[PDB]
Amino acid sequence: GLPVMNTPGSNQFLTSDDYQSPTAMPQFDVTPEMNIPGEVKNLMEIAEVDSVVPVNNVNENVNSLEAYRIPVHSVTETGAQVFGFTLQPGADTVMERTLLGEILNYYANWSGSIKLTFMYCGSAMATGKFLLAYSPPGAGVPKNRREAMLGTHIIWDIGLQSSCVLCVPWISQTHDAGFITCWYQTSIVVPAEVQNQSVILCFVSACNDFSVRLLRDSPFVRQT
Amino acid sequence: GLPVMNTPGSNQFLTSDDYQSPTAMPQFDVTPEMNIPGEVKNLMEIAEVDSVVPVNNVNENVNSLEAYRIPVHSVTETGAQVFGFTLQPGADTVMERTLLGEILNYYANWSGSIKLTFMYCGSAMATGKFLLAYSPPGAGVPKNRREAMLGTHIIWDIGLQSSCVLCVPWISQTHDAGFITCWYQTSIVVPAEVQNQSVILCFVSACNDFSVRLLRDSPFVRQT
Amino acid sequence: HVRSESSVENFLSRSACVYIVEYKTRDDTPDKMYDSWVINTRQVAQLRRKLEFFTYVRFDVEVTFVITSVQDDSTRQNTDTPALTHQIMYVPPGGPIPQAVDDYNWQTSTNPSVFWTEGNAPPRMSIPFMSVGNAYSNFYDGWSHFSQTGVYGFNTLNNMGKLYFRHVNDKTISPITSKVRIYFKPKHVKAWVPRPPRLCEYTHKDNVDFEPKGVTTSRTQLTISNS
Amino acid sequence: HVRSESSVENFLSRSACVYIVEYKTRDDTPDKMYDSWVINTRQVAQLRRKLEFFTYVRFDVEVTFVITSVQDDSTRQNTDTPALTHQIMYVPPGGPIPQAVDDYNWQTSTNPSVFWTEGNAPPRMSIPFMSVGNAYSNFYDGWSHFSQTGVYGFNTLNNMGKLYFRHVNDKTISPITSKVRIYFKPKHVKAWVPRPPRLCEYTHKDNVDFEPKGVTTSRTQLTISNS
């Protein structure tokens, strides 16, 4: 018949094949596709969803619902620190098991932006100010309200904005990445018959410029 | 299905394959090429660069910087010889480890031209004349200034040209190749309070008509 | 800025060894000469989690069988056995089931088989979407038949089939065991109504049951300091 | 007068055996049943010099594995072992690492593998440019992380991956060792900022360190004479 020469690489099963294959069940009628709502055609639709961050993961608080609640109250000083965490979505233990950290643990390379959101869950009568400082990578953690003030900061007034959104610029692990600290500016002023202890909760999601390059196995599933 | 006959040469791994291959990592985003200056698309751009030749490789001077300096001074005779080396870029020990000799040791066949350059590194007050003779292949080495004079020579005056360039014609090893000798013509005339001892340095590169035909392993890397 | 590897098909359409099937060619116990596998997606924990990102899925199936044989030691390793033929029969949902190596259900017509001789490229057969409903369910909040009887969270409807393996040849004179490996590559994947990943470990392959794990890894403090 | 063989691709895109990987199929020490290779370009001294003609390089990779097996001598050379299947798993930069032949990381999903049965043509898999930066560095004048801590001249950024090798089958009854040979052929080569060749010999595969050699071969005189 036709003259045909076999090249090397023949009769092997490379695991990432793309060739055709014969069907075990021809003459079979596949039931047609119905319109089911909520179709996913991209995993980076899933990571564009805000989700609560367990910032208060001090020990023995992890096995509870207190792991999300960030305590804030009236302070007799004024330049103290409320919270703080290293800005590493996937390496840090804070946003480790966050949904964005879970999409980002299935890849060895990832790059893009990141949104933070901070919501105050106190009463409608309280008021005060915070200082949300962003230490860029390379720069250290400030130890003062004043050292955090000369950096990149934002003053977030409780009494007129219950949610501040902080879209952090360029962050990567293979395209010390930064810090997010929260300082008191004023105390939380409260009227009579209103409780002093209150709560902040965090939220995080990516922006629309987020890419990944190389799939791998996740470091959290361990075989029995 | 389709009738297909296997020709001989099938299921072998010839080392110089050119066939297609399946990718281990599809669905991967390769980072784009950035403009980096200094792009090489041809190895015969590299060998068009002049480089210093260790002509003074008399023994125990090789382990120093004196290996490049060619001594020239005031001579009580007048027809003596300054330097000399066989004209074999890659076989000779003089331009063996020269960059042009290093591009030319990776090939069994090479042909083309060759530039020499001779720079005088003495004072601005000295003056004199040299005789740069070129013995063609087949012809012997002259033993006199006068025997070198009737051949192909060039008289290079120190006092008005600090660099003479000598583009040697056709030389090959599979397309005794020649000699380059340097004779005194006059002594080096010097005023008072100016030092007598001086230096010549060589340079070599190819021309634009240089070809190679068959790659091989280099004779200088020895396996541990 | 590509987002072509966060696709559902560039995340789920990859081959993975899911099960190892050991069987011999000469025994006395008449059920160690064959073995089977009920086809599901709940044995590799990696692929089970990657499919439990979504509630409903819908895919074709491409199975490649890697078949290797090693002879058991005996007095008679000096033999000349000709090349072995294996059978890989597929039983669709609603098909008969063999109960021995000499059973008649290895010979029935509407159970598609593959016959492979030792030495060739490994076999391969595609399996289409063979559910009655429109998509498989990873999760099912209910009972299959007649609630408070039957197992909670079963979903009868999403069975895909099962495989059976035997040596086609007669009983040899030396015992030779054959182990096959099953590479299950889903194709043309469409997924709906996403959901968070699992935090706890798995305890069984037929229910969602668990022990309560934490939320994350605990820190020592709440405010950060310098190095 | 051609200059088509002084191209960068006609100088660097050639196959070369870079490493030999020995592993067995039956032992007692549980780490001699597998072996690995961290992929770099600094083991063959020839290819290391030919890539140290240039500072930055950028290439695809085409690996062909030549796999051969020889049985170890014992009392039981008289056996009938079926054909062996090998696994060649690729771990990208940022992937898990197996620690035995029975470890779970041989079964994970985002580590692409190749399964080859004895007798066929040798396997082959392409590896793209998988660095975060724009080109690999042969030379790096600096520290990786937090200078004066960490090794001088490391460049974390240019890791390409690593391979792992095991026999897919169960433990046999006779010991059979398998040695594979790795043919590393770089493709689509682009190079920048050239630099002189190395004069001294090599002492290690992770630094540029050396002992001072001469400049050339010494002569007896400076002026030439007749034969």
Which of C72, C32, C70, C31 is CA-nearest to residue C174? Answer: C72
Interatomic CA distance for residues C14 and B24, integer angstroms: 11
User: Which one of D96, D115, D130 has the shortest CB-CB distance to A15?
Assistant: D115
Report yes or no: A4 at the B interface, CB cutoff 8 Å: yes
> In terms of CA atoms, which chain A residue is nearest residue D65?
A9
Which of A97, A90, A114 is CA-nearest to residue A216? Answer: A90
> In terms of CA atoms, which chain B residue is nearest residue A211?
B29
Q: Which chains touch D (3 or more CB pairs under 8 A)?
A: A, B, C
HEC secondary structure over chain C = CCCCCCCCHHHHCCCCEEEEEEECCCCCCCCCCEEEEECCCCCCHHHHHHHCCEEEEEEEEEEEEEEEEEECCCCCCCCCCCCCEEEEEEECCCCCCCCCCCCHHHCCCCCCEEEEECCCCCCEEEECCCCCCCCEECCCCCECCCCCCCCECCCHHHCCCEEEEEECCCCCCCCEEEEEEEEEEEEEEEEEEECCCCCCCCCCCCCCCCCCCCCCCCECCCCCCCC
- Across the interface, do A15 and D113 touch by the CB < 8 Å criterion? yes
Residue pointed to by tokens 């000349």: C80
> In terms of CA atoms, which chain B residue is nearest residue C7?
B27
Question: How remote is the C-alpha of B161 from its chain's centroid?
Answer: 22
SS3 content of chain A, % helix, strand, coil (to 5): 10, 35, 60
Token pair belonging to D194: 């050239």
Which of B88, B103, B101, B95 is CA-nearest to residue B45? Answer: B103
Contacts of A17 in chain B (CB under 8 A): 22
- Compute the nearest-CA separation of D33 from chain B (Å): 24
Rounded alpha-carbon distances, angstroms, from residue C70 to C22, C179, D86, D165, D214: 11, 8, 14, 20, 59
Which of B89, B108, B105 is CA-nearest to residue B174? Answer: B108
Contacts of B29 in chain C (CB under 8 A): 2, 4-5
- Across the interface, do D121 and A222 touch by the CB < 8 Å criterion? no
Q: Which chains touch B (3 or more CB pairs under 8 A)?
A: A, C, D
- For chain B, the structural domain boundaries read 1-224
Interatomic CA distance for residues D191 and B40, integer angstroms: 6
Instruction: Give the residue from A15, A60, A209 with the most C CB atoms within 10 Å of its CB, the best one to mutate.
Output: A15
- Compute the nearest-CA separation of A2 from chain B (Å): 6
Considering only CA atoms, give the Rg of chain B: 25
Token pair belonging to D100: 């035995």
- Compute the nearest-CA separation of B33 from chain C (Å): 14
Report yes or no: B26 at the C interface, CB cutoff 8 Å: yes
- Compute the nearest-CA separation of B32 from chain A (Å): 11
Total number of residues shown for chain B: 224
Interatomic CA distance for residues D200 and D211, integer angstroms: 7
Instruction: Give the residue from D64, D88, D104, D180 with the most A CB atoms within 10 Å of its CB, the best one to mutate.
Output: D104
Pairing type for strands B5-7 and A3-5 reads parallel
Query: A127: number of CA atoms within 13 Å, CB side?
Result: 5
Residue pointed to by tokens 């299950």: C184
Token pair belonging to D12: 């660097």
Q: Which residues pair with C152 in a beta bridge?
A: C143
- For chain C, the structural domain boundaries read 1-227
Per the CB < 8 A criterion, the answer to whether A149 and A135 are in contact is no
Contacts of C116 in chain D (CB under 8 A): none
Long-range contacts of C148-152 (CB under 8 A, 24+ apart): C151/C206, C152/C207
Question: How remote is the C-alpha of C145 from its chain's centroid?
Answer: 25
- Report DSSP state, residue B13: -
Which of B129, A15, C39, C63 is CA-nearest to residue D106? Answer: A15
The neighbour count for residue A215, using CB atoms within 10 Å, is: 24
Which of C221, C217, C210 is CA-nearest to residue A63? Answer: C217
Residue pointed to by tokens 């720079």: B119
Interatomic CA distance for residues A206 and A100, integer angstroms: 7
- Across the interface, do A57 and C215 touch by the CB < 8 Å criterion? yes
The neighbour count for residue B223, using CB atoms within 10 Å, is: 6
Q: Is the dihedral of CA C146, C151, C153, C159 positive or negative?
A: negative
The neighbour count for residue D171, using CB atoms within 10 Å, is: 13
Token pair belonging to D173: 């009854």
Q: What angle do CA A92, A93, A98 make, to 5 degrees?
A: 95
For residue A148, the SS3 value is helix
Contacts of D121 in chain A (CB under 8 A): 6-12
Which of B59, B222, B211, B70 is CA-nearest to residue B132? Answer: B70
- Compute the nearest-CA separation of D70 from chain B (Å): 20
The neighbour count for residue C87, using CB atoms within 10 Å, is: 17
D72: left (phi over 0), alpha (psi -120 to 50) or beta: beta
- Across the interface, do B29 and C10 touch by the CB < 8 Å criterion? no
What is the distance in angstroms between the CA of the first residue and the CA of the last residue of chain D? 34
Q: Which residues pair with C91 in a beta bridge?
A: C162
Report yes or no: B27 at the C interface, CB cutoff 8 Å: yes
Q: What angle do CA C107, C113, C116 make, to 5 degrees?
A: 115
Experimental approach taken: cryo-EM
Residue pointed to by tokens 């992380």: D145
Per the CB < 8 A criterion, the answer to whether D160 and D63 are in contact is no
Which of C68, B168, B25, D44 is CA-nearest to residue A215? Answer: B25
Which of A22, A46, A54, A11 is CA-nearest to residue A206? Answer: A46
User: Which one of D107, D111, D120 has the shortest CB-CB distance to A216?
Assistant: D111
* Residues A205, A211, A212, A218, Cα dihedral to 10°: 10
Interatomic CA distance for residues A164 and A172, integer angstroms: 23
Q: Which residues contact A99 (CB under 8 A, 6 or more apart)?
A: A46, A47, A49, A51, C196, C197
Which of C96, C91, C105, C209 is CA-nearest to residue C159? Answer: C91
Phi, psi of D57 (to 5 degrees): -135, 165
HEC secondary structure over chain D = CCCCCCCCHHHHCCCCEEEEEEECCCCCCCCCCEEEEECCCCCCHHHHHHHCCEEEEEEEEEEEEEEEEEECCCCCCCCCCCCCEEEEEEECCCCCCCCCCCCHHHCCCCCCEEEEECCCCCCEEEECCCCCCCCEECCCCCECCCCCCCCECCCHHHCCCEEEEEECCCCCCCCEEEEEEEEEEEEEEEEEEECCCCCCCCCCCCCCCCCCCCCCCCECCCCCCCC
Instruction: Give the residue from D1, D2, D3 with the most B CB atoms within 10 Å of its CB, the best one to mutate.
Output: D3
For residue A180, the SS3 value is strand
Token pair belonging to A24: 């075990």
Report yes or no: B9 at the D interface, CB cutoff 8 Å: no
What is the distance in angstroms between the CA of the first residue and the CA of the last residue of chain B? 54
- Across the interface, do B14 and A8 touch by the CB < 8 Å criterion? yes
Which of D135, D9, D136, D160 is CA-nearest to residue B32? Answer: D135
HEC secondary structure over B37-67 = CCEECCHHHHHHCCEECCCCCECCCCCCCCC
Interatomic CA distance for residues B82 and B73, integer angstroms: 9
Per the CB < 8 A criterion, the answer to whether A206 and A114 are in contact is yes
Per the CB < 8 A criterion, the answer to whether A218 and A104 are in contact is no
Q: Which residues contact A159 (CB under 8 A, 6 or more apart)?
A: A126, A127, A128
For residue B10, the SS3 value is coil
B147: left (phi over 0), alpha (psi -120 to 50) or beta: alpha
Burial class (CB in 10 A: 0-12, 13-18, 19+), C208: middle
> In terms of CA atoms, which chain B residue is nearest residue C9?
B27
Q: Which residues pair with C167 in a beta bridge?
A: C86
Per the CB < 8 A criterion, the answer to whether C106 and C190 are in contact is no
Q: Which residues contact C131 (CB under 8 A, 6 or more apart)?
A: A31, C157, C158, C159, C160
- Compute the nearest-CA separation of A210 from chain C (Å): 6
For residue A189, the SS3 value is strand
* Residues D131, D136, D140, D144, Cα dihedral to 10°: 10
Please, where are the H alpha helices in chain A?
99-104, 145-149
Which of B64, B84, B162, B80 is CA-nearest to residue B122? Answer: B162
For residue A103, the SS3 value is helix
Per the CB < 8 A criterion, the answer to whether D11 and B43 are in contact is yes
Residue pointed to by tokens 């999760």: C139
User: Which one of D112, D194, D215 has the shortest CB-CB distance to B40?
Assistant: D194
The neighbour count for residue C38, using CB atoms within 10 Å, is: 12
Long-range contacts of A94-97 (CB under 8 A, 24+ apart): A94/A53, A94/A54, A94/A55, A94/A57, A94/C216, A94/C219, A95/A53, A95/A204, A96/C216, A96/C217, A97/A54, A97/C199, A97/C215, A97/C216
Contacts of D107 in chain C (CB under 8 A): 16-17, 44, 46
Per the CB < 8 A criterion, the answer to whether D95 and A109 are in contact is no
Q: Which residues of C182-196 are buried (b: 16+ CB within 10 A; e: fewer)?
A: bbbbbbebbbbebee
- Across the interface, do B29 and C5 touch by the CB < 8 Å criterion? yes
Contacts of C92 in chain A (CB under 8 A): 25
Contacts of C70 in chain D (CB under 8 A): 81-82, 169-170, 172-173
Asked if the B1-224 domain carries CATH number 3.40.50.10860, the reply is: no
- Across the interface, do D93 and A174 touch by the CB < 8 Å criterion? yes
Contacts of B50 in chain D (CB under 8 A): none
- Compute the nearest-CA separation of A108 from chain B (Å): 11
Instruction: Give the residue from A11, A13, A143, A172 with the most C CB atoms within 10 Å of its CB, the best one to mutate.
Output: A13
Q: Which residues pair with C114 in a beta bridge?
A: C88
> In terms of CA atoms, which chain D residue is nearest residue A224?
D104
- Across the interface, do D217 and B96 touch by the CB < 8 Å criterion? yes
Q: Which residues pair with B83 in a beta bridge?
A: none
The neighbour count for residue A82, using CB atoms within 10 Å, is: 20
Query: What CATH architecture is C1-227?
Result: Sandwich (2.60)
Report yes or no: A213 at the D interface, CB cutoff 8 Å: yes
Q: Please name the amino acid found at residue C197.
A: P
Q: Which residues pair with B118 in a beta bridge?
A: B164, B202
State the DSSP string of B82-99.
EEEEE--TTTSSSSSSSH
Instruction: Give the residue from B10, B11, B27, B30 with the most C CB atoms within 10 Å of its CB, the best one to mutate.
Output: B27
Interatomic CA distance for residues A83 and A70, integer angstroms: 8
- Compute the nearest-CA separation of B18 from chain C (Å): 23
Token pair belonging to C153: 């969270």
Contacts of B61 in chain D (CB under 8 A): 218
B-C interface: how many C-beta pairs under 8 angstroms? 9
Q: Which chains touch C (3 or more CB pairs under 8 A)?
A: A, B, D
